[PDB]
Scaffold this active site. Structure first.
Site, mmCIF file in Angstrom:
data_model
loop_
_atom_site.group_PDB
_atom_site.id
_atom_site.type_symbol
_atom_site.label_atom_id
_atom_site.label_comp_id
_atom_site.label_asym_id
_atom_site.label_seq_id
_atom_site.Cartn_x
_atom_site.Cartn_y
_atom_site.Cartn_z
ATOM 1 N N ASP A 290 38.749 28.039 47.883
ATOM 2 C CA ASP A 290 39.063 29.206 47.066
ATOM 3 C C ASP A 290 39.046 30.490 47.882
ATOM 4 O O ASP A 290 39.915 31.348 47.723
ATOM 5 C CB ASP A 290 38.106 29.284 45.881
ATOM 6 C CG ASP A 290 38.460 28.287 44.813
ATOM 7 O OD1 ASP A 290 39.649 28.265 44.430
ATOM 8 O OD2 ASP A 290 37.583 27.513 44.394
ATOM 9 N N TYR A 374 38.946 27.482 37.427
ATOM 10 C CA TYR A 374 37.572 27.786 37.722
ATOM 11 C C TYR A 374 37.279 29.277 37.770
ATOM 12 O O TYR A 374 38.128 30.061 38.126
ATOM 13 C CB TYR A 374 37.119 27.064 38.978
ATOM 14 C CG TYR A 374 36.490 25.702 38.711
ATOM 15 C CD1 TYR A 374 36.835 24.582 39.457
ATOM 16 C CD2 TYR A 374 35.554 25.577 37.697
ATOM 17 C CE1 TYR A 374 36.251 23.350 39.193
ATOM 18 C CE2 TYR A 374 34.960 24.348 37.430
ATOM 19 C CZ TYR A 374 35.309 23.232 38.175
ATOM 20 O OH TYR A 374 34.694 21.997 37.904
#
Ligand SMILES: OCCc1ccccc1
Ligand SMILES: OCCc1ccccc1
Ligand SMILES: [Cu+2]
Ligand SMILES: [Cu+2]
Ligand code: NA
Ligand code: NA
Ligand code: NA
Ligand code: NA
Lengths: 620, 620
Positions: A290, A374
């Site tokens: 990420d 997420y």
């Protein structure tokens, strides 16, 4: 005047102008990363030079560039054409998120697969997933995204409730070619919705929660000056923001009497990775970074009062670049506030008759980011007693799959036919240490059990041992919870009043590290994640444990390369890289939106002070 | 009407009267322990019988007694004369704390030792330390305390700053005989004071702390009825108090739709021990069980507003017996309140456009106790999402010694000449489980790594395994942090909507367990402390992991004895005993009063619910 001030809108506009003028920002160019560079070492010379680093993408298929510019001098310091097969592809662009779905929607293989499943293409969302590096020869040097499909029944529907298993596709986002479509067979698409705002699913909302009011009638105990310089209860630091790492802390120091004592020069989460442990070909390639691949800072949320940050809040609104070089403000993207933290110290003494109680508090600096399904909260804490702590809070919606008829050793069931593949969330904290200055060393401290015998006749003794890590080759360390293993960062040249070197002790949570087989692509690309602690010698260009260009990099980049230099770290300018993470076997309770779970680490003073640093805290 | 209500003053007075009338509470008698007994199993018969258990000491040298009485019927159920050499001595009395100093003050050996060190006897305090069991034959069957000396320069002085090393004495507190005085040689008595309220030491107090106001304008979200029954955000429980264990939680249950679902029948800290790891004969015998030997409940602090418990607080004021059977109220000895706990769940979705944020909160039940130099806060937490957590907060003043010239492998230096011997604080949580009823089982869950190869060609797979603990003989378990080891308590007869048994997962901190050599006295007397997890079959008389009479018990008592029965625990009424603790190498910052450090554990639902239990939480 501070060289650690936040990037300004004007600075970002200068970078755009400098780049444009130099011929580097034509219409086919995109800024994939833009960030300000920290002040250099040995900078006690007084000569401010604000520099920005830029990764420039080209949508027409030309090679990308790495460029450093000075917004002080208005000059291009360096411009280097990148060979992406060699050194990696550039971070994923937000504007590319929609491209995968769009390219597949006119592809015959993809439409065929959808048709077999009776899915209207207009209702099929496709996750833009990083590709990694596997066996596909045509992918070297190509900017690839992989796509997994989720059905969305209507505009406000949660697509994650409806994964389309047995199907994956690969796309070259530049050539606009769908390179492969893989259909391993139809799986039922889970039918239950996951809409956590639907009264049908939530039921009647609670009326039992009475309000909790947190206020500060005199305002906060911390001050903010120069935009991002914090001073609070003897602490001093600068709060930075980078589009890749997110919130970064600079110059963490503690005012001890007359002295301003440095503790950490730079603290950041320099990488995070989410490896999946499902051996299905549909997902066995999936490991998104990420931070390194997607840049968590660019997706920082605007935090609202009474909802995200409660109490007396002071916000920073950091400025970033859009894909075209225009300054964009993330309004209220950073929360700063102090929280009550219960009891600090307490004693009622049977002989003096004195009863004593003091309360604790912590300074919090935080932001929340979103990357697809997420969402994470990143929190740094500074405590009255000198403790430094980080905490990650994981929430959002779990990445879903079909749940196989007959079950799974690698997937859990969330709802009828709905699966959640096993995975980890693993972080790397990069801590550029400066315990009372830059001359630091690290010791590994283990509890030592002792055998009953001479000098220990009652078998009650136990002790500890410390091992100084002298060179990078021997500084790759693993946890040992059973023997209470910690790591102490000390200054061998700075002693406390008992003539011991001042120190700070790192306390890990001792969670599992990377589970993948060591021969895996992800073990090579995320080598940092395989060990709990790394120590390196500081270097300007050693920023991330995974290297500069994580996307589709073939492996070995970052820490494993850096430590090959086998540099002296015993009484030198060093950097600690701590791996910590969550191993996630999803539970039914995680569905349809996940309650926050947490992981992190802390450092506590270890003979840093000559006595407790909180004896001067008032009685309240 | 509740059989779990707190003991009342009137009930305690009834016990006194019943005991007196039966001839069991003459002038030479002391109550060393008095507590109400929980309702028996299979009690769906409706026949309340409030019983109290009493340990009665005799100061004239007669054998002590264990007595159970009914305050319902006014009868003595059982009265048994104890043989203390066999089954252990009774808990230390508060009125005995001063006796050790008083007996030594007229002893020639002791006065000689003091005289050599030029210490005025009037200024020498003596810690009343439990004796344990070692090589001293004359001690079997004798009520012994050991004494270590600390100088107090004036009434309000902190004696701990001035340990008298090289000297220890043993006393029979009943015969009033000093049995031994051991002088291994003079050590300098540390001269610096440890007075943490002295402006000389504290310096000018801080004026930088601005107030933090926590209030609830509508009052609390929990209700208290029947004195100690709590209802809060679907939780239901009864808060008990026992003079030995302190706060005890009963009947922890969660309202899930129309159903009241049990989770834990009884939760308590059933023992704690502090073993010292200094092989000096002056301290090598030292291992105090604050719960089992001293009774932490009787020393619970009166908690003051704005200082100990902040916000909207509801207090319980539990009643205990004094040494003579008179009821004594501990005013505001238990705090109950709800705290904001940051973010509960959060997602901003790229496809639905829905932005969602909910906040978390926890119900806190806590008390603070003091036993000599040490003070602890015990905290139980119930979270909105079904999580149950305990936290111990350790503070007070560290137990001190001389710091040896030339240093120590088993002692740390706090100040010039002032040492702090290494030690642990180890707790045992006794969790009488009732996951959806009493038919429970425990599984040990380990992460399972998988090898690259057929069926895992990319080497990315990982899994988990569960091992059901079927019999007590195989239910003594150790931590494995490296493999993410947890323990799941499930109900094999109660399945969720995905047809899996409902469960709760225990997450340990995986701190070191007891460090002593296994041949040590303390390894035998505190066998529970040597392993992280024990499972037993429920039995009325199996209350403490160390047995009923810990003081001077020769060993093997409690858990190691119980598990010898090798009973069926697979789908049965079971009890989980979790060992968790802190290993303490004291730091300079711990002196002269210790900043709070913490340790604990938690359980989270594991397929207990059919989906997230917090979907009905409002938006705030
Ligand atoms: O977390 C980054 C991977 C991801 C991106 C977009 C949608 C789903 C997943
Ligand atoms: O914690 C119980 C041991 C102890 C009791 C009294 C004074 C010092 C120590
Ligand atoms: Cu997860
Ligand atoms: Cu301690
Ligand atoms: Na390469
Ligand atoms: Na450094
Ligand atoms: Na015995
Ligand atoms: Na039970």
């Amino acid at each position: 005047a501070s060289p650690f001030r936040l990037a300004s809108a004007g600075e970002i506009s200068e970078v755009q102008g400098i780049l444009r003028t130099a011929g580097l920002l034509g219409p086919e160019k995109r800024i994939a990363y833009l960030g300000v560079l920290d002040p250099a070492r040995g900078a006690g010379s007084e000569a401010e030079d604000r520099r920005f680093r830029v990764f420039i993408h080209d949508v027409s298929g030309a090679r990308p560039q790495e460029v450093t510019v000075s917004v002080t001098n208005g000059t291009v310091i360096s411009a280097v054409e990148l060979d992406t097969a060699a050194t990696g592809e550039l971070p994923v662009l937000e504007e590319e998120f929609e491209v995968v779905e769009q390219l597949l929607a006119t592809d015959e293989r993809w439409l065929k697969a959808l048709a077999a499943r009776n899915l209207d293409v207009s209702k099929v969302r496709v996750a833009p997933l990083s590709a990694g590096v596997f066996e596909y020869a045509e992918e070297r040097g190509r900017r690839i995204l992989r796509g997994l499909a989720f059905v969305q029944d209507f505009p406000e529907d949660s697509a994650w409730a409806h994964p389309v298993d047995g199907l994956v596709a690969y796309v070259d986002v530049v050539s606009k070619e769908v390179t492969r479509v893989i259909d391993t067979g139809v799986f039922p698409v889970p039918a239950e919705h996951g809409n956590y705002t639907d009264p049908e699913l939530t039921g009647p909302l609670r009326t039992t929660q009475k309000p909790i009011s947190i206020t500060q009638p005199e305002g906060p105990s911390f001050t903010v000056t120069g935009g991002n310089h914090i001073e609070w209860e003897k602490w001093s630091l600068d709060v930075g923001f980078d589009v890749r790492e997110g919130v970064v802390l600079h110059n963490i120091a503690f005012r001890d009497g007359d002295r301003l004592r440095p503790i950490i020069n730079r603290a950041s989460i320099a990488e995070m990775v989410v490896p999946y442990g499902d051996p299905s070909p549909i997902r066995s390639w999936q490991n998104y970074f990420d931070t390194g691949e997607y840049l968590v800072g660019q997706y920082a949320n605007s935090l609202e009062l009474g909802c995200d940050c409660l109490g007396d809040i002071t916000y920073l609104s950091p400025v970033i670049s859009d894909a075209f070089g225009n300054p964009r403000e993330i309004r209220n993207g950073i929360c700063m506030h102090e929280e009550d933290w219960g009891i600090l110290a307490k004693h009622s003494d049977l002989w003096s008759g004195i009863n004593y109680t003091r309360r604790n508090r912590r300074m919090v600096i935080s932001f929340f980011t979103t990357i697809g399904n997420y969402d994470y909260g990143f929190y740094w804490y500074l405590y009255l007693d000198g403790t430094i702590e980080f905490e990650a809070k994981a929430t959002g919606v779990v990445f879903t799959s079909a749940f196989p008829e007959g079950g799974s050793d690698n997937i859990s069931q969330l709802a009828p036919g709905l699966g959640a593949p096993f995975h980890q969330h693993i972080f790397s904290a990069r801590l550029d240490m400066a315990i009372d200055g830059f001359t630091n060393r690290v010791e590994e401290e283990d509890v030592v059990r002792q055998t009953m015998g001479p000098g220990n006749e009652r078998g009650n003794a136990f002790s500890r041992k410390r091992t100084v890590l002298t060179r990078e080759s021997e500084a790759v360390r693993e946890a040992d919870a059973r023997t209470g293993r910690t790591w102490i960062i000390s200054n061998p040249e700075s002693k406390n009043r008992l003539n011991e070197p001042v120190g700070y002790k790192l306390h890990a949570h001792n969670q599992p590290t990377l589970l993948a087989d060591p021969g895996s692509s992800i073990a090579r690309r995320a080598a940092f994640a395989t060990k709990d602690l790394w120590v390196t010698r500081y270097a300007d260009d050693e920023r991330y444990p995974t290297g500069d260009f994580v996307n589709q990099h073939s492996g070995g980049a970052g820490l494993p390369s850096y430590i090959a230099q086998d540099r002296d770290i015993d009484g030198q300018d060093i950097v600690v890289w701590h791996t910590f993470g969550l191993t996630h076997f999803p539970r039914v309770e995680d569905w349809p939106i996940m309650p926050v779970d947490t992981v992190g680490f802390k450092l506590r003073p270890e003979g840093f002070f000559d006595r407790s640093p909180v004896l001067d805290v008032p009685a309240n």
